[PDB]
Design a protein around this ligand. Structure first.
Ligand SMILES: NC(=[NH2+])NCCC[C@H](N)C(=O)O
Ligand SMILES: [Mg+2]
Ligand SMILES: [Mg+2]
Ligand SMILES: [Mg+2]
Ligand SMILES: [Mg+2]
Ligand SMILES: [Mg+2]
Ligand SMILES: [Mg+2]
Ligand SMILES: [Mg+2]
Ligand SMILES: [Mg+2]
Ligand SMILES: [Mg+2]
Ligand SMILES: [Mg+2]
Ligand SMILES: [Mg+2]
Ligand SMILES: [Mg+2]
Ligand SMILES: [Mg+2]
Ligand SMILES: [Mg+2]
Ligand SMILES: [Mg+2]
Ligand SMILES: [Mg+2]
Ligand SMILES: [Mg+2]
Ligand SMILES: [Mg+2]
Ligand SMILES: [Mg+2]
Ligand SMILES: [Mg+2]
Ligand SMILES: [Mg+2]
Ligand SMILES: [Mg+2]
Ligand SMILES: [Mg+2]
Ligand SMILES: [Mg+2]
Ligand SMILES: [Mg+2]
Ligand SMILES: [Mg+2]
Ligand SMILES: [Mg+2]
Ligand SMILES: [Mg+2]
Ligand SMILES: [Mg+2]
Ligand SMILES: [Mg+2]
Ligand SMILES: [Mg+2]
Ligand SMILES: [Mg+2]
Ligand SMILES: [Mg+2]
Ligand SMILES: [Mg+2]
Ligand SMILES: [Mg+2]
Ligand SMILES: [Mg+2]
Ligand SMILES: [Mg+2]
Ligand SMILES: [Mg+2]
Ligand SMILES: [Mg+2]
Ligand SMILES: [Mg+2]
Ligand SMILES: [Mg+2]
Ligand SMILES: [Mg+2]
Ligand SMILES: [Mg+2]
Ligand SMILES: [Mg+2]
Ligand SMILES: [Mg+2]
Ligand SMILES: [Mg+2]
Ligand SMILES: [Mg+2]
Ligand SMILES: [Mg+2]
Ligand SMILES: [Mg+2]
Ligand SMILES: [Mg+2]
Ligand SMILES: [Mg+2]
Ligand SMILES: [Mg+2]
Ligand SMILES: [Mg+2]
Ligand SMILES: [Mg+2]
Ligand SMILES: [Mg+2]
Ligand SMILES: [Mg+2]
Ligand SMILES: [Mg+2]
Ligand SMILES: [Mg+2]
Ligand SMILES: [Mg+2]
Ligand SMILES: [Mg+2]
Ligand SMILES: [Mg+2]
Ligand SMILES: [Mg+2]
Ligand SMILES: [Mg+2]
Ligand SMILES: [Mg+2]
Ligand SMILES: [Mg+2]
Ligand SMILES: [Mg+2]
Ligand SMILES: [Mg+2]
Ligand SMILES: [Mg+2]
Ligand SMILES: [Mg+2]
Ligand SMILES: [Mg+2]
Ligand SMILES: [Mg+2]
Ligand SMILES: [Mg+2]
Ligand SMILES: [Mg+2]
Ligand SMILES: [Mg+2]
Ligand SMILES: [Mg+2]
Ligand SMILES: [Mg+2]
Ligand SMILES: [Mg+2]
Ligand SMILES: [Mg+2]
Ligand SMILES: [Mg+2]
Ligand SMILES: [Mg+2]
Ligand SMILES: [Mg+2]
Ligand SMILES: [Mg+2]
Ligand SMILES: [Mg+2]
Ligand SMILES: [Mg+2]
Ligand SMILES: [Mg+2]
Ligand SMILES: [Mg+2]
Ligand SMILES: [Mg+2]
Ligand SMILES: [Mg+2]
Ligand SMILES: [Mg+2]
Ligand SMILES: [Mg+2]
Ligand SMILES: [Mg+2]
Ligand SMILES: [Mg+2]
Ligand SMILES: [Mg+2]
Ligand SMILES: [Mg+2]
Ligand SMILES: [Mg+2]
Ligand SMILES: [Mg+2]
Ligand SMILES: [Mg+2]
Ligand SMILES: [Mg+2]
Ligand SMILES: [Mg+2]
Ligand SMILES: [Mg+2]
Ligand SMILES: [Mg+2]
Ligand SMILES: [Mg+2]
Ligand SMILES: [Mg+2]
Ligand SMILES: [Mg+2]
Ligand SMILES: [Mg+2]
Ligand SMILES: [Mg+2]
Ligand SMILES: [Mg+2]
Ligand SMILES: [Mg+2]
Ligand SMILES: [Mg+2]
Ligand SMILES: [Mg+2]
Ligand SMILES: [Mg+2]
Ligand SMILES: [Mg+2]
Ligand SMILES: [Mg+2]
Ligand SMILES: [Mg+2]
Ligand SMILES: [Mg+2]
Ligand SMILES: [Mg+2]
Ligand SMILES: [Mg+2]
Ligand SMILES: [Mg+2]
Ligand SMILES: [Mg+2]
Ligand SMILES: [Mg+2]
Ligand SMILES: [Mg+2]
Ligand SMILES: [Mg+2]
Ligand SMILES: [Mg+2]
Ligand SMILES: [Mg+2]
Ligand SMILES: [Mg+2]
Ligand SMILES: [Mg+2]
Ligand SMILES: [Mg+2]
Ligand SMILES: [Mg+2]
Ligand SMILES: [Mg+2]
Ligand SMILES: [Mg+2]
Ligand SMILES: [Mg+2]
Ligand SMILES: [Mg+2]
Ligand SMILES: [Mg+2]
Ligand SMILES: [Mg+2]
Ligand SMILES: [Mg+2]
Ligand SMILES: [Mg+2]
Ligand SMILES: [Mg+2]
Ligand SMILES: [Mg+2]
Ligand SMILES: [Mg+2]
Ligand SMILES: [Mg+2]
Ligand SMILES: [Mg+2]
Ligand SMILES: [Mg+2]
Ligand SMILES: [Mg+2]
Ligand SMILES: [Mg+2]
Ligand SMILES: [Mg+2]
Ligand SMILES: [Mg+2]
Ligand SMILES: [Mg+2]
Ligand SMILES: [Mg+2]
Ligand SMILES: [Mg+2]
Ligand SMILES: [Mg+2]
Ligand SMILES: [Mg+2]
Ligand SMILES: [Mg+2]
Ligand SMILES: [Mg+2]
Ligand SMILES: [Mg+2]
Ligand SMILES: [Mg+2]
Ligand SMILES: [Mg+2]
Ligand SMILES: [Mg+2]
Ligand SMILES: [Mg+2]
Ligand SMILES: [Mg+2]
Ligand SMILES: [Mg+2]
Ligand SMILES: [Mg+2]
Ligand SMILES: [Mg+2]
Ligand SMILES: [Mg+2]
Ligand SMILES: [Mg+2]
Ligand SMILES: [Mg+2]
Ligand SMILES: [Mg+2]
Ligand SMILES: [Mg+2]
Ligand SMILES: [Mg+2]
Ligand SMILES: [Mg+2]
Ligand SMILES: [Mg+2]
Ligand SMILES: [Mg+2]
Ligand SMILES: [Mg+2]
Ligand SMILES: [Mg+2]
Ligand SMILES: [Mg+2]
Ligand SMILES: [Mg+2]
Ligand SMILES: [Mg+2]
Ligand SMILES: [Mg+2]
Ligand SMILES: [Mg+2]
Ligand SMILES: [Mg+2]
Ligand SMILES: [Mg+2]
Ligand SMILES: [Mg+2]
Ligand SMILES: [Mg+2]
Ligand SMILES: [Mg+2]
Ligand SMILES: [Mg+2]
Ligand SMILES: [Mg+2]
Ligand SMILES: [Mg+2]
Ligand SMILES: [Mg+2]
Ligand SMILES: [Mg+2]
Ligand SMILES: [Mg+2]
Ligand SMILES: [Mg+2]
Ligand SMILES: [Mg+2]
Ligand SMILES: [Mg+2]
Ligand SMILES: [Mg+2]
Ligand SMILES: [Mg+2]
Ligand SMILES: [Mg+2]
Ligand SMILES: [Mg+2]
Ligand SMILES: [Mg+2]
Ligand SMILES: [Mg+2]
Ligand SMILES: [Mg+2]
Ligand SMILES: [Mg+2]
Ligand SMILES: [Mg+2]
Ligand SMILES: [Mg+2]
Ligand SMILES: [Mg+2]
Ligand SMILES: [Mg+2]
Ligand SMILES: [Mg+2]
Ligand SMILES: [Mg+2]
Ligand SMILES: [Mg+2]
Ligand SMILES: [Mg+2]
Ligand SMILES: [Mg+2]
Ligand SMILES: [Mg+2]
Ligand SMILES: [Mg+2]
Ligand SMILES: [Mg+2]
Ligand SMILES: [Mg+2]
Ligand SMILES: [Mg+2]
Ligand SMILES: [Mg+2]
Ligand SMILES: [Mg+2]
Ligand SMILES: [Mg+2]
Ligand SMILES: [Mg+2]
Ligand SMILES: [Mg+2]
Ligand SMILES: [Mg+2]
Ligand SMILES: [Mg+2]
Ligand SMILES: [Mg+2]
Ligand SMILES: [Mg+2]
Ligand SMILES: [Mg+2]
Ligand SMILES: [Mg+2]
Ligand SMILES: [Mg+2]
Ligand SMILES: [Mg+2]
Ligand SMILES: [Mg+2]
Ligand SMILES: [Mg+2]
Ligand SMILES: [Mg+2]
Ligand SMILES: [Mg+2]
Ligand SMILES: [Mg+2]
Ligand SMILES: [Mg+2]
Ligand SMILES: [Mg+2]
Ligand SMILES: [Mg+2]
Ligand SMILES: [Mg+2]
Ligand SMILES: [Mg+2]
Ligand SMILES: [Mg+2]
Ligand SMILES: [Mg+2]
Ligand SMILES: [Mg+2]
Ligand SMILES: [Mg+2]
Ligand SMILES: [Mg+2]
Ligand SMILES: [Mg+2]
Ligand SMILES: [Mg+2]
Ligand SMILES: [Mg+2]
Ligand SMILES: [Mg+2]
Ligand SMILES: [Mg+2]
Ligand SMILES: [Mg+2]
Ligand SMILES: [Mg+2]
Ligand SMILES: [Mg+2]
Ligand SMILES: [Mg+2]
Ligand SMILES: [Mg+2]
Ligand SMILES: [Mg+2]
Ligand SMILES: [Mg+2]
Ligand SMILES: [Mg+2]
Ligand SMILES: [Mg+2]
Ligand SMILES: [Mg+2]
Ligand SMILES: [Mg+2]
Ligand SMILES: [Mg+2]
Ligand SMILES: [Mg+2]
Ligand SMILES: [Mg+2]
Ligand SMILES: [Mg+2]
Ligand SMILES: [Mg+2]
Ligand SMILES: [Mg+2]
Ligand SMILES: [Mg+2]
Ligand SMILES: [Mg+2]
Ligand SMILES: [Mg+2]
Ligand SMILES: [Mg+2]
Ligand SMILES: [Mg+2]
Ligand SMILES: [Mg+2]
Ligand SMILES: [Mg+2]
Ligand SMILES: [Mg+2]
Ligand SMILES: [Mg+2]
Ligand SMILES: [Mg+2]
Ligand SMILES: [Mg+2]
Ligand SMILES: [Mg+2]
Ligand SMILES: [Mg+2]
Ligand SMILES: [Mg+2]
Ligand SMILES: [Mg+2]
Ligand SMILES: [Mg+2]
Ligand SMILES: [Mg+2]
Ligand SMILES: [Mg+2]
Ligand SMILES: [Mg+2]
Ligand SMILES: [Mg+2]
Ligand SMILES: [Mg+2]
Ligand SMILES: [Mg+2]
Ligand SMILES: [Mg+2]
Ligand SMILES: [Mg+2]
Ligand SMILES: [Mg+2]
Ligand SMILES: [Mg+2]
Ligand SMILES: [Mg+2]
Ligand SMILES: [Mg+2]
Ligand SMILES: [Mg+2]
Ligand SMILES: [Mg+2]
Ligand SMILES: [Mg+2]
Ligand SMILES: [Mg+2]
Lengths: 64, 116, 149, 202
RNA sequence: GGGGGGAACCUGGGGAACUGAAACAUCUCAGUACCCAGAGGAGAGGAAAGAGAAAUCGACUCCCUGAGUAGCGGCGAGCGA
RNA sequence: CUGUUGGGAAGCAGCGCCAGAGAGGGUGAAAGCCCCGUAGGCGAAAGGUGGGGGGAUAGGUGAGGGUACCCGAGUACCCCGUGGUUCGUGGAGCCAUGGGGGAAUCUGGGCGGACCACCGCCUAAGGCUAAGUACUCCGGGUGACCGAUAGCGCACCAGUACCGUGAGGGAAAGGUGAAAAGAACCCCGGGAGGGGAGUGAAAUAGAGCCUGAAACCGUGGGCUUACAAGCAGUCACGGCCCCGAGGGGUUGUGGCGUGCCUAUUGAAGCAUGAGCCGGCGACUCACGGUCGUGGGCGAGCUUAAGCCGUUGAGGCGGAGGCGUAGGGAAACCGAGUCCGAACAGGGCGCAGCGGCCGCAAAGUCCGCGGCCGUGGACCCGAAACCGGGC
RNA sequence: GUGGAGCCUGGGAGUGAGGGCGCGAGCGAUAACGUCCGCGUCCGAGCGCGGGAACAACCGAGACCGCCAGCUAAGGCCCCC
RNA sequence: GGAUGACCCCAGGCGGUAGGGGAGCGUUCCCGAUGCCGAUGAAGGCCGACCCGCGAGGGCGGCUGGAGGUAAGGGAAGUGC
RNA sequence: GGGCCUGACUGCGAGGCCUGCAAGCCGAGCAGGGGCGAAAGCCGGGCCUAGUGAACCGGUGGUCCCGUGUGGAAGGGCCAU
């Protein structure tokens, strides 16, 4: 039968126009009182996932 | 459609069993023992094709040695002498001359003694 | 030309890879599977796209972000598809949603929005919206923007 | 592009046709593969180790018998057991692109036109259903049965008279297809079939 | 008038576990296997106290599609209009 | 039809004929015209069917105005406990209902995802209803389906023999020949069996019967062997035998030489497996994905279910799908957009070859191939778990 | 320095039990065919070939096929040889 | 070189397990085939010191057998122990 | 040791270190609004290397982005913790 979209990926990740995979940086969900403004600010950006992990996640999103 | 074995395996086994004609006991009668015997036999033939070139060179050298010692030198002096006289008759032909043309071989001994 | 002349081009019909059929083939015995382990087994591995041998996976360690929605689901609202001026160059006279839908430019169930890539034409262009620049370019070119609701 | 002999009570006129210049053999092969695959019955079938008639009983204990271990006798290792990966009922059809079929049709006619093996006719003189009648018409038409012929006409009576001949294949125009064209050394259509053919490749 | 039978199909009343989640309990397998009652050449469903946003449609059933979408989910495995 | 070879003609040869019939199966071998058929037609007194045609019968039928009589009850409704749904307590509505409380008759009531208002949709608590759908014990048609270890467990007297207290389990086993012409009679023998005779184209087609492989057993012949050390062979030379500057068979002596497979750092290994032979025996298929590849068309490409045709003929069908724009959680804006006060900086995005013409291409469709996901998913194997029976 | 070199993109893997030896250390007992790292090598996969009596990894050397031809390597040249 | 594997000439590579790639052989079945081979003998079996092929194999000849077999070129798999 | 102070900033970030991933680390410079200094300038905690914990689920403050016919609301999203 047809593949199912992985919804854990669909809720965490996006495929860009050229097929990169972009995610939110980790590490600022909590324990933030003692993190510098630089850590908090830069952890609020998206980042491009490394190629090996990006290819696996794209296989999980066959209909995006 | 279905493709059963049919004739294919019997023909394959008969090719092997024919090659194993003459082998002892099941080595010529059973397809399995024939093929194991053939494996060894093929490696032997390859190895002995190589080894035959050496076997015959040993025999030539032994015969050449004995013909030399009838004229008072040994093989290794005889070969050195031929090298310095520039003579390049090979050991297959030197051994044939030693047996079939003793006059010619004696003159070769002469050339070798003179070259040193 | 007869049936005994009908042939695929070179490479149009390749032979398959048959494993486990003898030493000479290069694929005998282990059938290109290597020796033991979970991957050689009939049934094989867990999904390589996700599983990582028991550790928390690359994907599950990334944070969720955004509205995921709730039952009873997607809120029905009007949706827009952009169509650039350059795509309108083939038309004459009066372009409308139904027309762009026909030519394969606009998708059914989408309101039309004109965007400003390319060059405007002197056309009567009926649409549900226009970008700022698509308005500029269309006015300046002599075309007529008609705005539906 | 092509000058096609027409057969008339007024002589061998000529008709011009806009048939493709390039005959593409691979594509014709793709249409025939499609025609021959979609007519397949796909009725080969076998029984799996689950569908065979035997019980699921373990035939003898796992250990301590001195024999190899076994489960049920439907396992494919047994004579009389299930088949591993046998054929199952199967649909071999697929949707070849319409433009490939249409363009294939034109190339098959164009290939016959370029050999001089395409002949159009206005009517079949005295062909009123009898084989002996179509034979007499064919003789004068230059069809002596030394070449196989694909006869394409809507005249039901003409098809009935020709169809028992070993060297004739008969079709109504709505049935023109490249396998049948390429099967036969000659192509004969009346002007009516020639027209529904033109409507199709347009 | 009933009773009992009928390969499979159907509806209703009950209803697992292995397995999957690389352990496991929610979850899955699955309302599946199976037991029971009943129906018939089919059975169920059916003529809106419907849908759900169209100022709209107009019983029910069935196929394609919508769509692996909307959503549901130890937001896991997966499930899925 | 004739001739001819042959046991036999349908083969080959001569000369014809039919065909809405040259599908196929027989007949002594290979037959359009010998047989059974095939194309095309024809046929029911009796029983069944009859969804199509015709006829009955049942049943069906106005407008204002007033009246406020009726419009399905332990029901709606609310609360508690659950089920159904995509919804697992969630903001949890809807539909259903085991417990408790418990209405109203249109100015009545239910619904539009808590709730309220507005705006709409519908008329619960009685029942029936063809067709389109499912299945295949049964009959028929057809296979790039099997061909006796295959195909159903069963081609055959099989759910049998046999096994089990029972539920239940569950085989093997097809073929003389064209025709029985199935071998009178004689001979050895108690018979079995054979030897003659005889039949047959053929009898190592003789019924323990087509073909008749291999392991295995034996008779005859050539070479060889009783002072010799061996994974059994191989290289060399010589002897003998055979077929006719060559070759085949055999092996006396000399040289060299640690089976196969598996598993292992490492096996001749005293580690696994195999008595030998024959047959069966393991990487597939569907759907989706990803990349490559052969073609079609190209800012476009493509149809699905169906419908019509065909009876190994294709066509129609654009619903829909992918692509043509991206960025943002979103509102939204858009060749940009998001973060931001920023017009800052950054993230993610945006731009053919030849002479209007070719050619090429995004993309997409179909074929092919590698690999992935879902299924038992390369094959065989547990100990166990569960259900219903015995 | 043109090599079965290197770099980029993508398809397919297998491997994730190593082992001996040399040298450098730790552990051990300045024990182990011990053990654990580093540099190198060979075996693994070269149980193919010569030498080392025999012998995966010591010395010699990387086996496309054939030859009753020649030169060498390690090791040898009294006989077995 | 010649001009596109026409074949020749020069040079170099060619140990190999897991494994990647390439080119082929054969088996069953379909198109080719209302054909063609076949009783002046199909398939299968048993021989062969002969021919072709690196090889898997393919021919050819004799014997057996007694009725089927199937080309160039393509297609599909229950395809090789 | 003392004076004045809150840069133990907000919005970003060229370029790198490290590195299988995910993380971790250093960071000039531009803008906003500041601190100290006459000024040059320094200041995005602490001489430096440890003092730490990905997701999911949930709390709180803000924002006023979504709000299932419409206006609200329920509940979510986003920023901060
Ligand atoms: N007009 C025709 N379709 N002729 C075909 C010849 C015979 C074909 N088998 C049929 O059933 O009709
Ligand atoms: Mg999730
Ligand atoms: Mg975070
Ligand atoms: Mg947070
Ligand atoms: Mg929070
Ligand atoms: Mg700190
Ligand atoms: Mg800070
Ligand atoms: Mg801070
Ligand atoms: Mg911030
Ligand atoms: Mg989609
Ligand atoms: Mg087999
Ligand atoms: Mg067989
Ligand atoms: Mg065989
Ligand atoms: Mg074999
Ligand atoms: Mg044979
Ligand atoms: Mg063979
Ligand atoms: Mg012998
Ligand atoms: Mg023996
Ligand atoms: Mg013996
Ligand atoms: Mg034997
Ligand atoms: Mg061999
Ligand atoms: Mg050799
Ligand atoms: Mg050797
Ligand atoms: Mg040598
Ligand atoms: Mg001396
Ligand atoms: Mg010398
Ligand atoms: Mg010399
Ligand atoms: Mg294929
Ligand atoms: Mg495949
Ligand atoms: Mg290949
Ligand atoms: Mg193969
Ligand atoms: Mg092989
Ligand atoms: Mg390979
Ligand atoms: Mg290999
Ligand atoms: Mg093996
Ligand atoms: Mg592999
Ligand atoms: Mg592979
Ligand atoms: Mg593999
Ligand atoms: Mg291993
Ligand atoms: Mg391994
Ligand atoms: Mg193994
Ligand atoms: Mg291992
Ligand atoms: Mg293992
Ligand atoms: Mg492995
Ligand atoms: Mg298994
Ligand atoms: Mg497994
Ligand atoms: Mg852990
Ligand atoms: Mg969504
Ligand atoms: Mg709903
Ligand atoms: Mg105008
Ligand atoms: Mg088929
Ligand atoms: Mg079967
Ligand atoms: Mg079957
Ligand atoms: Mg079974
Ligand atoms: Mg079973
Ligand atoms: Mg069964
Ligand atoms: Mg049974
Ligand atoms: Mg059973
Ligand atoms: Mg069972
Ligand atoms: Mg059981
Ligand atoms: Mg059982
Ligand atoms: Mg045991
Ligand atoms: Mg025992
Ligand atoms: Mg035993
Ligand atoms: Mg056994
Ligand atoms: Mg046993
Ligand atoms: Mg057992
Ligand atoms: Mg079994
Ligand atoms: Mg079993
Ligand atoms: Mg069974
Ligand atoms: Mg059996
Ligand atoms: Mg079977
Ligand atoms: Mg059986
Ligand atoms: Mg069976
Ligand atoms: Mg099988
Ligand atoms: Mg299987
Ligand atoms: Mg199986
Ligand atoms: Mg089917
Ligand atoms: Mg396929
Ligand atoms: Mg289809
Ligand atoms: Mg089209
Ligand atoms: Mg015909
Ligand atoms: Mg025909
Ligand atoms: Mg024909
Ligand atoms: Mg025909
Ligand atoms: Mg009853
Ligand atoms: Mg009863
Ligand atoms: Mg009944
Ligand atoms: Mg039920
Ligand atoms: Mg229970
Ligand atoms: Mg459980
Ligand atoms: Mg399962
Ligand atoms: Mg299972
Ligand atoms: Mg799983
Ligand atoms: Mg589990
Ligand atoms: Mg598990
Ligand atoms: Mg467990
Ligand atoms: Mg369930
Ligand atoms: Mg039930
Ligand atoms: Mg069932
Ligand atoms: Mg009941
Ligand atoms: Mg009943
Ligand atoms: Mg019916
Ligand atoms: Mg009913
Ligand atoms: Mg009802
Ligand atoms: Mg009603
Ligand atoms: Mg869609
Ligand atoms: Mg479920
Ligand atoms: Mg005669
Ligand atoms: Mg005759
Ligand atoms: Mg004749
Ligand atoms: Mg016919
Ligand atoms: Mg016939
Ligand atoms: Mg026939
Ligand atoms: Mg014939
Ligand atoms: Mg025939
Ligand atoms: Mg006949
Ligand atoms: Mg008829
Ligand atoms: Mg009839
Ligand atoms: Mg009335
Ligand atoms: Mg009234
Ligand atoms: Mg009233
Ligand atoms: Mg009511
Ligand atoms: Mg009541
Ligand atoms: Mg309730
Ligand atoms: Mg529920
Ligand atoms: Mg509930
Ligand atoms: Mg919730
Ligand atoms: Mg709910
Ligand atoms: Mg009301
Ligand atoms: Mg009310
Ligand atoms: Mg209600
Ligand atoms: Mg309610
Ligand atoms: Mg409500
Ligand atoms: Mg509603
Ligand atoms: Mg609402
Ligand atoms: Mg109201
Ligand atoms: Mg309603
Ligand atoms: Mg009706
Ligand atoms: Mg009904
Ligand atoms: Mg019905
Ligand atoms: Mg049916
Ligand atoms: Mg039937
Ligand atoms: Mg067959
Ligand atoms: Mg057959
Ligand atoms: Mg049998
Ligand atoms: Mg059977
Ligand atoms: Mg048989
Ligand atoms: Mg039967
Ligand atoms: Mg019986
Ligand atoms: Mg018992
Ligand atoms: Mg009994
Ligand atoms: Mg049993
Ligand atoms: Mg049987
Ligand atoms: Mg008989
Ligand atoms: Mg017979
Ligand atoms: Mg007798
Ligand atoms: Mg007598
Ligand atoms: Mg007597
Ligand atoms: Mg007597
Ligand atoms: Mg007798
Ligand atoms: Mg006798
Ligand atoms: Mg006679
Ligand atoms: Mg004869
Ligand atoms: Mg015989
Ligand atoms: Mg016979
Ligand atoms: Mg026969
Ligand atoms: Mg016999
Ligand atoms: Mg016999
Ligand atoms: Mg003897
Ligand atoms: Mg002695
Ligand atoms: Mg002696
Ligand atoms: Mg020897
Ligand atoms: Mg010698
Ligand atoms: Mg000789
Ligand atoms: Mg000899
Ligand atoms: Mg040994
Ligand atoms: Mg050894
Ligand atoms: Mg072997
Ligand atoms: Mg083994
Ligand atoms: Mg082992
Ligand atoms: Mg071991
Ligand atoms: Mg070991
Ligand atoms: Mg041994
Ligand atoms: Mg031993
Ligand atoms: Mg042992
Ligand atoms: Mg052993
Ligand atoms: Mg073991
Ligand atoms: Mg045994
Ligand atoms: Mg044996
Ligand atoms: Mg065997
Ligand atoms: Mg595969
Ligand atoms: Mg399969
Ligand atoms: Mg597949
Ligand atoms: Mg693919
Ligand atoms: Mg493709
Ligand atoms: Mg196309
Ligand atoms: Mg093109
Ligand atoms: Mg879709
Ligand atoms: Mg798109
Ligand atoms: Mg978005
Ligand atoms: Mg904002
Ligand atoms: Mg920017
Ligand atoms: Mg940029
Ligand atoms: Mg393309
Ligand atoms: Mg893959
Ligand atoms: Mg499965
Ligand atoms: Mg499987
Ligand atoms: Mg698989
Ligand atoms: Mg037990
Ligand atoms: Mg359990
Ligand atoms: Mg348990
Ligand atoms: Mg029980
Ligand atoms: Mg290399
Ligand atoms: Mg390399
Ligand atoms: Mg591969
Ligand atoms: Mg791996
Ligand atoms: Mg591994
Ligand atoms: Mg490991
Ligand atoms: Mg390790
Ligand atoms: Mg180990
Ligand atoms: Mg190590
Ligand atoms: Mg190493
Ligand atoms: Mg050693
Ligand atoms: Mg060492
Ligand atoms: Mg040293
Ligand atoms: Mg050391
Ligand atoms: Mg150390
Ligand atoms: Mg000491
Ligand atoms: Mg060690
Ligand atoms: Mg040591
Ligand atoms: Mg040491
Ligand atoms: Mg080492
Ligand atoms: Mg290994
Ligand atoms: Mg070495
Ligand atoms: Mg090496
Ligand atoms: Mg080895
Ligand atoms: Mg050696
Ligand atoms: Mg050595
Ligand atoms: Mg040595
Ligand atoms: Mg030695
Ligand atoms: Mg070595
Ligand atoms: Mg080499
Ligand atoms: Mg020398
Ligand atoms: Mg030296
Ligand atoms: Mg010595
Ligand atoms: Mg000596
Ligand atoms: Mg060369
Ligand atoms: Mg190699
Ligand atoms: Mg290659
Ligand atoms: Mg082949
Ligand atoms: Mg070939
Ligand atoms: Mg084969
Ligand atoms: Mg077939
Ligand atoms: Mg045919
Ligand atoms: Mg034939
Ligand atoms: Mg003939
Ligand atoms: Mg004859
Ligand atoms: Mg003969
Ligand atoms: Mg054959
Ligand atoms: Mg055959
Ligand atoms: Mg041969
Ligand atoms: Mg023969
Ligand atoms: Mg004969
Ligand atoms: Mg026949
Ligand atoms: Mg063929
Ligand atoms: Mg061929
Ligand atoms: Mg073809
Ligand atoms: Mg097939
Ligand atoms: Mg198989
Ligand atoms: Mg200070
Ligand atoms: Mg201070
Ligand atoms: Mg101040
Ligand atoms: Mg950087
Ligand atoms: Mg990094
Ligand atoms: Mg750290
Ligand atoms: Mg500043
Ligand atoms: Mg300042
Ligand atoms: Mg300042
Ligand atoms: Mg100041
Ligand atoms: Mg300043
Ligand atoms: Mg700074
Ligand atoms: Mg400090
Ligand atoms: Mg300080
Ligand atoms: Mg610190
Ligand atoms: Mg930290
Ligand atoms: Mg966290
Ligand atoms: Mg979790
Ligand atoms: Mg949250
Ligand atoms: Mg909030
Ligand atoms: Mg709002
Ligand atoms: Mg609202
Ligand atoms: Mg209000
Ligand atoms: Mg609002
Ligand atoms: Mg308020
Ligand atoms: Mg709120
Ligand atoms: Mg935060």
């Amino acid at each position: 039968p047809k593949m199912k979209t992985h919804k854990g990926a669909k809720k965490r990740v996006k495929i860009t126009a050229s097929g990169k995979v972009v995610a939110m940086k980790t590490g600022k969900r909590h324990l933030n009182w003692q993190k510098s403004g630089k850590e908090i600010r830069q952890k609020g950006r998206k980042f491009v996932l490394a190629k090996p992990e990006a290819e696996r996640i794209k296989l999980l999103l066959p209909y995006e | 459609p279905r493709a059963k074995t049919g004739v294919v395996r019997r023909r394959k086994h008969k090719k092997i069993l024919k090659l194993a004609k003459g082998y002892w006991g099941l080595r010529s009668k059973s397809f399995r023992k024939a093929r194991e015997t053939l494996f060894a036999a093929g490696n032997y033939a390859y190895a002995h094709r190589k080894r035959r070139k050496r076997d015959f060179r040993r025999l030539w050298i032994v015969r050449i040695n004995a013909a030399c010692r009838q004229h008072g030198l040994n093989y290794s002096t005889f070969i050195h002498g031929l090298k310095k006289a520039g003579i390049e008759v090979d050991r297959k032909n030197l051994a044939d001359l030693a047996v079939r043309e003793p006059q010619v071989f004696a003159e070769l001994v002469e050339r070798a003694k003179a070259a040193q | 030309m007869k049936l005994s002349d009908l042939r695929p081009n070179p490479g149009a019909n390749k032979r398959r890879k048959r494993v486990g059929r003898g030493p000479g083939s290069g694929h005998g015995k282990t059938a290109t599977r290597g020796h033991k382990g979970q991957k050689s087994r009939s049934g094989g591995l867990k999904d390589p796209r996700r599983f990582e041998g028991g550790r928390s996976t690359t994907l599950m360690r990334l944070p969720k972000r955004g509205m995921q929605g709730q039952v009873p689901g997607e809120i029905k609202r009007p949706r827009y598809q952009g169509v650039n001026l350059k795509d309108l160059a083939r038309f004459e006279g009066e372009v409308t949603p139904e027309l762009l839908v026909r030519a394969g430019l606009l998708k059914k169930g989408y309101r039309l929005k004109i965007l400003g890539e390319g060059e405007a034409k002197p056309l009567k262009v009926v649409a549900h919206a226009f970008s700022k620049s698509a308005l500029e370019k269309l006015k300046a070119a002599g075309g007529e923007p008609v705005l539906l609701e | 592009v092509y000058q096609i002999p027409v057969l008339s009570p007024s002589g061998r006129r000529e008709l011009a046709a806009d048939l493709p210049a390039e005959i593409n053999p691979h594509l014709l092969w793709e249409v025939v593969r499609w025609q021959l695959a979609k007519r397949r019955r796909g009725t080969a079938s076998t029984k799996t180790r689950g569908e065979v008639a035997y019980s699921g009983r373990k035939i003898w204990p796992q250990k301590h018998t001195g024999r190899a271990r076994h489960g049920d006798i439907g396992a494919p290792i047994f004579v009389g057991g299930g088949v591993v990966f046998g054929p199952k009922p199967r649909d071999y059809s697929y949707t070849l692109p319409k433009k490939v079929r249409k363009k294939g049709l034109a190339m098959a006619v164009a290939d016959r036109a370029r050999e001089g093996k395409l002949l159009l006719v206005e009517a079949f003189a005295g062909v009123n259903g009898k084989t002996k009648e179509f034979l007499a018409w064919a003789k004068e038409a230059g069809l002596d049965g030394s070449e196989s012929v694909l006869l394409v006409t809507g005249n039901e009576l003409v098809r009935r008279a020709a169809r028992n001949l070993p060297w004739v294949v008969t079709l109504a125009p709505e049935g023109l297809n490249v396998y049948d064209i390429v099967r036969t050394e000659r192509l004969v259509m009346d002007l009516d079939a020639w027209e529904v053919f033109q409507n199709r490749i347009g």
